Structures are given as C-alpha cells and as structure tokens.
Design an enzyme around this catalytic site. Structure first.
Site, PDB file in Angstrom:
ATOM      1  CG  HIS A  61      -2.045  -0.832   1.353  1.00  0.00           C
ATOM      2  ND1 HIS A  61      -2.653  -1.124   2.569  1.00  0.00           N
ATOM      3  CD2 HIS A  61      -2.698  -1.620   0.450  1.00  0.00           C
ATOM      4  CE1 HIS A  61      -3.608  -2.023   2.398  1.00  0.00           C
ATOM      5  NE2 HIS A  61      -3.658  -2.341   1.131  1.00  0.00           N
ATOM      6  CG  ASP A 103      -3.167  -3.855   6.026  1.00  0.00           C
ATOM      7  OD1 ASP A 103      -3.822  -3.805   4.979  1.00  0.00           O
ATOM      8  OD2 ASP A 103      -2.623  -2.863   6.562  1.00  0.00           O
ATOM      9  CB  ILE A 150      -3.460   8.759   7.732  1.00  0.00           C
ATOM     10  CG1 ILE A 150      -2.756   7.462   8.144  1.00  0.00           C
ATOM     11  CG2 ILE A 150      -2.487   9.889   7.518  1.00  0.00           C
ATOM     12  CD1 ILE A 150      -1.788   6.964   7.077  1.00  0.00           C
ATOM     13  CB  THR A 151      -8.016  11.436   6.405  1.00  0.00           C
ATOM     14  OG1 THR A 151      -8.524  10.098   6.631  1.00  0.00           O
ATOM     15  CG2 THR A 151      -7.410  11.522   5.028  1.00  0.00           C
TER      16      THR A 151
HETATM   17  C1  FAD Z   1      -1.049  -1.840  10.937  1.00  0.00           C
HETATM   18  C2  FAD Z   1      -1.710  -0.512  10.597  1.00  0.00           C
HETATM   19  C3  FAD Z   1      -2.044  -0.154   9.340  1.00  0.00           C
HETATM   20  C4  FAD Z   1      -2.636   1.090   9.095  1.00  0.00           C
HETATM   21  N1  FAD Z   1      -2.941   1.382   7.805  1.00  0.00           N
HETATM   22  C5  FAD Z   1      -3.505   2.560   7.585  1.00  0.00           C
HETATM   23  C6  FAD Z   1      -3.865   2.894   6.235  1.00  0.00           C
HETATM   24  O1  FAD Z   1      -3.631   2.111   5.354  1.00  0.00           O
HETATM   25  N2  FAD Z   1      -4.426   4.110   6.048  1.00  0.00           N
HETATM   26  C7  FAD Z   1      -4.693   4.999   7.126  1.00  0.00           C
HETATM   27  O2  FAD Z   1      -5.206   6.046   6.876  1.00  0.00           O
HETATM   28  N3  FAD Z   1      -4.339   4.695   8.357  1.00  0.00           N
HETATM   29  C8  FAD Z   1      -3.786   3.503   8.623  1.00  0.00           C
HETATM   30  N4  FAD Z   1      -3.485   3.179   9.879  1.00  0.00           N
HETATM   31  C9  FAD Z   1      -3.892   4.091  10.972  1.00  0.00           C
HETATM   32  C10 FAD Z   1      -2.637   5.060  11.108  1.00  0.00           C
HETATM   33  O3  FAD Z   1      -1.552   4.155  11.130  1.00  0.00           O
HETATM   34  C11 FAD Z   1      -2.863   5.881  12.349  1.00  0.00           C
HETATM   35  O4  FAD Z   1      -3.998   6.716  11.953  1.00  0.00           O
HETATM   36  C12 FAD Z   1      -1.745   6.884  12.609  1.00  0.00           C
HETATM   37  O5  FAD Z   1      -0.418   6.514  12.204  1.00  0.00           O
HETATM   38  C13 FAD Z   1      -1.744   7.235  14.123  1.00  0.00           C
HETATM   39  O6  FAD Z   1      -0.822   8.541  14.233  1.00  0.00           O
HETATM   40  P1  FAD Z   1      -0.087   8.950  15.497  1.00  0.00           P
HETATM   41  O7  FAD Z   1       0.729  10.167  14.960  1.00  0.00           O
HETATM   42  O8  FAD Z   1      -0.933   9.176  16.573  1.00  0.00           O
HETATM   43  O9  FAD Z   1       0.692   7.795  15.960  1.00  0.00           O
HETATM   44  P2  FAD Z   1       1.799   6.822  15.314  1.00  0.00           P
HETATM   45  O10 FAD Z   1       1.889   6.918  13.955  1.00  0.00           O
HETATM   46  O11 FAD Z   1       1.738   5.547  16.081  1.00  0.00           O
HETATM   47  O12 FAD Z   1       3.150   7.362  15.789  1.00  0.00           O
HETATM   48  C14 FAD Z   1       3.467   8.308  16.832  1.00  0.00           C
HETATM   49  C15 FAD Z   1       4.982   8.289  17.075  1.00  0.00           C
HETATM   50  O13 FAD Z   1       5.323   8.464  18.510  1.00  0.00           O
HETATM   51  C16 FAD Z   1       6.665   7.895  18.624  1.00  0.00           C
HETATM   52  N5  FAD Z   1       6.889   7.665  20.036  1.00  0.00           N
HETATM   53  C17 FAD Z   1       6.269   6.708  20.783  1.00  0.00           C
HETATM   54  N6  FAD Z   1       6.680   6.695  22.041  1.00  0.00           N
HETATM   55  C18 FAD Z   1       7.633   7.683  22.106  1.00  0.00           C
HETATM   56  C19 FAD Z   1       8.460   8.151  23.222  1.00  0.00           C
HETATM   57  N7  FAD Z   1       8.400   7.656  24.428  1.00  0.00           N
HETATM   58  N8  FAD Z   1       9.316   9.173  22.917  1.00  0.00           N
HETATM   59  C20 FAD Z   1       9.390   9.691  21.655  1.00  0.00           C
HETATM   60  N9  FAD Z   1       8.687   9.329  20.597  1.00  0.00           N
HETATM   61  C21 FAD Z   1       7.811   8.309  20.866  1.00  0.00           C
HETATM   62  C22 FAD Z   1       6.472   6.566  17.907  1.00  0.00           C
HETATM   63  O14 FAD Z   1       7.717   6.004  17.678  1.00  0.00           O
HETATM   64  C23 FAD Z   1       5.806   7.060  16.628  1.00  0.00           C
HETATM   65  O15 FAD Z   1       6.634   7.250  15.520  1.00  0.00           O
HETATM   66  C24 FAD Z   1      -2.874   1.966  10.180  1.00  0.00           C
HETATM   67  C25 FAD Z   1      -2.547   1.607  11.471  1.00  0.00           C
HETATM   68  C26 FAD Z   1      -1.969   0.376  11.702  1.00  0.00           C
HETATM   69  C27 FAD Z   1      -1.593  -0.073  13.084  1.00  0.00           C
END
Ligand code: FAD
Length: 455
Positions: free
Chosen positions: A50, A154, A371-372
């Site tokens: 993807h 997935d 993501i959106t």
């Molecule tokens: C397997 C999977 C597939 C997905 N596929 C899709 C898709 O195809 N399309 C879609 O729209 N959404 C998808 N999603 C949903 C998307 O992944 C989430 O919407 C999004 O990434 C969540 O964003 P976030 O910024 O909150 O957290 P995340 O992306 O989880 O990341 C936040 C960050 O915080 C960092 N972090 C954590 N702890 C610490 C710490 N103590 N100190 C410093 N940094 C730290 C992590 O390393 C990370 O990089 C998927 C989710 C999963 C699990």
C-alpha cells in the site's frame, strides 16, 4: 521566539507541527522521536503493498525542511528526557506518541508459540526494529486472525499474496524469504459480532476478494436478512454490506468460478465467535488450534453485544494472530492517564489540569482514526494551542528550547538524529534496494545506523 515541541513523529506530530508552522510565523517546533527514523506508523504500520497510503511522507518531509522545524530522532521521552523537562524548556508541549501497546487476549494458551499480536506481525514485515527477531513459524497450513478490521485484512493479505507480487515492495528482505517458504494456505478472520459490525472498509475488502491466487469463503447463512437491515443505511455502510452480501450469495461467472476453482490459497470470514482458549499441539511445543465460544447478538443498532450461547467450536490452525485493540501507555510520572480508554485525559487537546501540555493523534482520541482523521483532528489541537498562545495563557517572555534539552542529552550520552541524518539514512536504504528492484531495503540495526552517521 515561541518554542513549541512535539513528542512522536507520526502523523499526529507532523500534522500538528504542520499547522503550527503555517499559522504562526516565528514559532519554532522540535519533533522528538524514540525510533531513529521518523514517520511512525506511516512507515511501520501501513502495509508494504500500500505504498500510495504512505505518500503523506511527502508532506511530512516538506514540513521537516522548514527552517523553523527540527527533528530529534533516537530520543525516548520518559527515559532519555522527561516530559517535565520538555515542559520547562518550551512554551508548549504536544503529546503525540501514539498507542504503543496491544490489548492482550487474556485467554489460557495465549503464551503458546505461534500466538502473536497482529501489530507485531506487521512490525516484523515492516522493519520495526523491536520485532526484527519475531521469526514466525509459517510452516503450518492455517492462520486464524481475531478481530475484523483493516489490520486483520492487512495481515491476511500478506500471508496469502503470491510472494512474487510482493517482491518489488519495501517489505523486508527477511520477511519476504519467510513468506517464500510459508506453507500457510488458508486464513480465517474471526469476529465476535456479525457482518453488520465488521470494522473493515470497502477498499480493503475488495482487495481481499480480488487477491490473485485466492478464493473467498463466506457462509450464506451469516448474511440472512442482510439486505433488509441495510435498507436505510448510509452509502458507505450499505455499499460495504452489499459487497459482502454479493460475494456470499451470488453465483460468480464462468471465469471467476474457474479462478476460484484453481486458487491454491483461501480466506474466509467467521462470525459470532469469541476467543476462549489457544489449543496446544500434542507435545505442548506450539499452537495447534483455537477454542471459540459461540455467541448470539442482542440489543439494537450500534449497541449490540454478543452473548455466549453455551456452545463452543474448535478451529485448527498453527498461527493465532490477535488484532483486537491498541492502547496508549503512560510515558512519564507527571502525565495524566485514563487506563480504561488508554488515553491521556484532555479537553479538545488541552491536557486535564496541566497548562502548556497538549495532545493529538491516537493518544488524544483513542486508536480509531485513520490518517486523515488524525490529520484534521491534529490541526484542531494546533488551533487551540496557538489560540491559548495568542491569549497569553502560556508562560511569557523567553524559553531555551533545544539549547537546554540538547545539553541534557549530551550529558546523558544520548546521540540525537537530525533530519539530515535521516536523509542520509534514507539514501542508504534506497541504494540497497536498487539492486533488487525495491523502493528501499530498510535498515533494521540501530548500531549500524548510528555508525553510518559517524558515531
Ligand atoms: C497496521 C496498521 C495499518 C494502518 N494502515 C492505515 C492505512 O492504510 N491508512 C490509514 O489512513 N491509516 C492507517 N493506519 C492508521 C494510522 O496508522 C494511524 O492513523 C496513525 O499513524 C496514528 O498517528 P499517530 O501520529 O498518533 O501515531 P503513530 O503513527 O503511532 O506514531 C506516533 C509516534 O510516537 C513515537 N513515540 C512513541 N513513544 C515515544 C516516546 N516515548 N518518545 C518519543 N517518541 C515516541 C512513535 O515512535 C511514533 O513514531 C494503520 C494503522 C496500523 C496499526
């Protein structure tokens, strides 16, 4: 110059910084990340087949190249530096570090070799360093996945796509090789409620049905009275439901009947079944099945709860993948936490009772958005933060920002990765994927990665 900083460099973080940078002409934003590379789940969660979903990396990167933004990779907040330190150093601090845990199954036998959390299985193939040595035993012929959402879809897809179709993706070389020898020919995606309650979406469901070399296995009986309940349903829900309906009850064609006839692999959708126990192989060395409890739906609409009937079903398999729920973890002592909803208590992004402390992304709303949603919702957190800033509700005058924090890291012997450093890491991943046709061959070893950078 206002000093803001964010914790986590996934969509929540980059998107919150994006808004801050666009709406405040002189603010400086620092992004702390625990992994050595940024982007979080866009890189470690979105499947390798993807790549189009990962194109948001293009907007993360232009944000990271602003002269007022800096990335701090390899800095684990709550261990390398506390949140309070970040709080004293900057005028505002945004918690956006995702939802790292997975909710355990909590059932007897969940420890048996062959039982994994779906998110860890994705990290394995996605090159998340902590899962590098996950070495899943793909020698059995069947896999059961608990939970009917896209993550389940997935992993199902990756266990069944013919390995050659994966060959030019950015999947790890090591996982690819594991899939090549895999004997996994069938994948059951088990849910406890019914077709109405599956949580997957149409783009994934249809990729599942049209996945070369595979044939779907839906039971007509699960979809009785389906077309009648979705009569009033909104477009999204209804289209999905008819796609399930159609695949389950209509006779295919001569070409599609034939394709299913010769497919070596298969995938089904099981309903009204809840995980009761992992069943042991005769010798106790691995999983050999899962004991499911039969359930019956009660209540109406969005409030239907499955209730056991008393009946159970033994479903053989050598892989139990759990994908039912991620939860945030409490990162620092000083940060509020709601253990029920696994979220940091907040009111539209203002953390409950802690001025200057905001939140966005999964840690702000729960692990549901894609993501959106995360995108838009994160701009809402940036809106508040900057409004509070403008109203003067953040400490005034001057703050040191990275100048102070850098000192603490240096003294602790923590080597931070800049954006440039990631650009150097990126190049190497690209260069080593060129020989084999891939967009990149991911670097799995942090030591090796630190040495390529000169440490
Ligand atoms: C397997 C999977 C597939 C997905 N596929 C899709 C898709 O195809 N399309 C879609 O729209 N959404 C998808 N999603 C949903 C998307 O992944 C989430 O919407 C999004 O990434 C969540 O964003 P976030 O910024 O909150 O957290 P995340 O992306 O989880 O990341 C936040 C960050 O915080 C960092 N972090 C954590 N702890 C610490 C710490 N103590 N100190 C410093 N940094 C730290 C992590 O390393 C990370 O990089 C998927 C989710 C999963 C699990």
């Amino acid at each position: 110059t206002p000093q803001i900083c964010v914790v986590g460099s996934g969509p929540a973080g980059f998107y919150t910084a994006q808004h801050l940078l666009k709406h405040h002409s002189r603010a400086h934003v620092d992004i702390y990340e625990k992994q050595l590379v940024p982007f979080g789940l866009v890189r470690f969660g979105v499947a390798p087949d993807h790549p189009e979903v990962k194109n948001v990396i293009n907007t993360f990167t232009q944000t990271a190249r602003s002269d007022r933004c800096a990335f701090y990779g390899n800095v684990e907040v709550g261990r390398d530096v506390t949140v309070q330190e970040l709080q004293d150093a900057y005028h505002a601090v945004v918690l956006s570090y995702g939802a790292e845990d997975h909710q355990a199954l909590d059932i007897p036998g969940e420890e048996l070799p062959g039982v994994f959390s779906a998110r860890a299985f994705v990290g394995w193939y996605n090159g998340l360093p902590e899962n590098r040595e996950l070495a899943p035993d793909l020698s059995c012929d069947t896999a059961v996945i608990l939970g009917q959402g896209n993550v389940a879809l997935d992993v199902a897809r990756i266990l069944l796509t013919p390995p050659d179709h994966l060959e030019k993706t950015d999947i790890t070389e090591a996982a690819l090789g594991a899939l090549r020898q895999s004997r996994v020919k069938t994948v059951w995606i088990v849910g406890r409620r019914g077709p109405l309650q599956v949580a997957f979406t149409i783009k994934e469901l249809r990729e599942m049905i049209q996945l070369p070399g595979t044939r779907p296995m839906l039971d007509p009986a699960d979809f009785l009275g389906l077309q009648d309940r979705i009569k009033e349903a909104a477009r999204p829900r209804k289209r999905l439901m008819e796609l399930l309906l159609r695949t389950a009850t209509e006779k295919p064609g001569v070409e599609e009947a034939a394709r299913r006839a010769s497919a070596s692999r298969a995938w089904g959708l099981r309903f009204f079944r809840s995980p009761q126990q992992v069943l042991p192989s005769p010798d106790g060395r691995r999983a050999a099945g899962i004991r499911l409890a039969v359930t019956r739906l009660e209540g109406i609409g969005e409030a239907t709860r499955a209730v056991p009937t008393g009946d159970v079903e033994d479903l053989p398999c050598g892989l139990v993948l759990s994908s039912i729920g991620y939860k945030s973890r409490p990162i620092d002592p000083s940060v509020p936490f709601d253990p029920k909803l696994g979220v940091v208590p907040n009111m539209e992004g203002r953390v409950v009772d802690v001025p200057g402390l905001y939140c966005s992304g999964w840690v702000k709303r729960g692990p549901t958005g894609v993501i959106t949603t995360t995108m838009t919702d994160s701009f809402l957190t940036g809106q508040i933060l900057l409004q509070d800033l403008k109203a003067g509700h953040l400490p005034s005058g001057p703050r040191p920002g990275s100048a102070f924090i850098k000192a603490l890291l240096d003294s602790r012997g923590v080597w931070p990765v800049s954006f440039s450093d990631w650009e150097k890491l990126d190049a190497e991943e690209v260069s080593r994927g060129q020989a084999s046709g891939k967009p990149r061959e991911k670097l799995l070893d942090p030591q090796e990665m630190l040495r390529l950078l000169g440490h």
